[PDB]
Design a protein around this ligand. Sequence first.
Ligand code: HEM
Ligand code: HEM
Lengths: 362, 363
Amino acid sequence: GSAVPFHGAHQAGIATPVQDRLHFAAFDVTTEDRAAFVALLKEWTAAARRLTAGHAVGEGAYGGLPEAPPDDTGEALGLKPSRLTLTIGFGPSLFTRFGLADLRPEALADLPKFPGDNLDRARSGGDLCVQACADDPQVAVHAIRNLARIGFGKVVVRWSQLGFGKTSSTTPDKQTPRNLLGFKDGTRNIAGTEKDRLDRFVWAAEKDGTPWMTGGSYLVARRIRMHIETWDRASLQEQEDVFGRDKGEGAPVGKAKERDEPFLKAMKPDAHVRLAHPDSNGGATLLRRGYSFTDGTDGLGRLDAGLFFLAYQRDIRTGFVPVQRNLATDALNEFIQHVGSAVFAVPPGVRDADDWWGSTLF
Amino acid sequence: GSAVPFHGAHQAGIATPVQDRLHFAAFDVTTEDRAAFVALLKEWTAAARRLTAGHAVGEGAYGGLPEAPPDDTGEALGLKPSRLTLTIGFGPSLFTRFGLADLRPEALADLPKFPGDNLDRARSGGDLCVQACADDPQVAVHAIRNLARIGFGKVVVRWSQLGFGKTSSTTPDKQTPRNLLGFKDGTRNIAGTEKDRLDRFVWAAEKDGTPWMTGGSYLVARRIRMHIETWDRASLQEQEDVFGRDKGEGAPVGKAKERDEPFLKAMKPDAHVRLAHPDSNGGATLLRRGYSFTDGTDGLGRLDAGLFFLAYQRDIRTGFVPVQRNLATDALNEFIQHVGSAVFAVPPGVRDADDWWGSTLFG
Ligand code: HEM
Ligand code: HEM
């Protein structure tokens, strides 16, 4: 129920312990006025400071002038902060506006087409994103709703994704959650305590070539549909062979415990863990921070199910791209399809009460 | 606060404490073979007994024969029972199968068309429902996914809805949840503690005319979209006037406290509370047990959110129908739209370890 501090050198919501719920929204910008957009970023920052401390935005949810709409929509009244974090990112398309073209980071790379991609263009891309994570879904929806309202006339929601449960871990001392295939997901991640590993693999450094991004990170989002009918008829051995870990304990094949180190040569050559492991990818390491989703039925008699995969990294070209390229032969590909994609530059943290989202860029 | 008993005279999930999360699924039946369907109901009951105790279905999620698919899909391993309840219901369309046409309860009435209805046929109806409620949404989803799998070849999933209420880890049990319009929702309801009110208004009695339904109830489900962005532009006064209660405290107009009894004549004539109150409907009283939903954003960038309204009652004709008819002129209608609907007969409880869902109907 506690608050996660909002200010810092880095934005919260990355290294932070992974909260139970996600509401992710991508926005397109509809104003060509730079000053108007800067004013929005400041108003959003002010709102975020309220929201993440469990307070209502603006002058509150009630007790104002009867003839005015309340400043806050009110559905989070009486609720705790619930570890709400709000993380903003800027998409490549933003940099075509406001004279920003030459400030687009090299590390904000467009992704290549990957074999098997079936990307919905309507649920891909976006000028900007807001990741809202919290332990209470109502708290997360309230935050996104109120930001969108404040931004009316300057930004529109392009697409959104709710995540009902986490499929990631930045806290190895706590139980690793399972994805909808029934496997633990998050054992070998980067922990929030691993400052050296965060600095090496997650945070952008001044020397990487884009000074305004120092202390930021780069985000890849992939909406992945799971073929659960196909998976559910697979044998136990087939499932375990796909991953290279057993299902019950989630230990590497041959070993007894979840957190025993993988011995890659005992896994099938097309096992997911074997192909995704840093040692298979020249050391490339990601911070995975995704969530599960179900968006109803598929119209063919079955539940829809998927994973909204989020990865943070210091450079898209040295993080997600090499690892995904190496997944071209993954046994897991029989059971999944990527159907949405976006990339974002996640700026540095809001340093104090006078700072604002995007201040280093603008 | 860990598990809710599965067995009882009544199915759990109606009068038992309201859990934080919902996964509601409607199923259509694909078999014409009564014996095959009965067999399914027995297998589903066996699975439900395991699921509600926090155990995997069948022989488990791992450790069986390597060359066999696991009996349980495994995504709830490591989780707690989470107060899971599984409540089954039978839709009117089920009664056109298996020779059951003369056993359809008269209280399982088809709803009339109501003004402003915009029902999506794909997210309406269904031969069967399973209401899965739990504090952890993964526990609920796991239940529905595994029931659907056990039933594959005999049933299909027609439509599915996830919902949320409060989060109990951080929110006191007594506090009334707010809906997504920002108003407290549930103040004047039937509580599961009110045994006599449940007998009067919720449970079917034998003398009501359908003996197999004694101890059961009737469910109306309505997927109600809110026009969030239009609502959020309304003034505070307009919003309070729509309901007849203030937004901060949720007190009736002219009163000080949430739980103060309303004075209906102080409210506007078409205020929601005034139109919905039992006194305005000949005493008709409902058990509301709905959940909020937020599914995403639509193609216009608007929030696809609302209330997945669930009401339990002793007879649809004397519960939901009169009350919803009375909402024809509700000021709230400007801001909502009913976009899905279904009705179900919820049979009596599973009495003991040898009983099974639907045993009073199938025999
Ligand atoms: C639906 C899609 C996916 C599923 C179900 C899945 C599942 C898993 C599982 C069960 C593990 C083992 C436990 C762990 O260490 O986390 C794992 C590990 C991993 N996955 Fe995935 N994954 C998916 C997609 C991806 C994608 C798209 C990437 C990257 C492009 C990826 C990268 C990784 C990495 C880096 C590891 C850790 C390998 C190691 O260092 O041991 N996964 N995944
Ligand atoms: C999105 C749709 C709806 C919203 C936002 C809504 C909201 C509310 C709110 C805020 C209250 C007052 C507090 C309370 O006592 O719970 C209320 C009361 C009530 N509502 Fe609704 N409602 C909706 C739909 C319906 C429908 C479809 C029905 C029935 C057909 C209904 C029946 C009732 C009843 C019976 C009461 C209690 C009245 C009393 O006895 O004081 N509501 N609703």
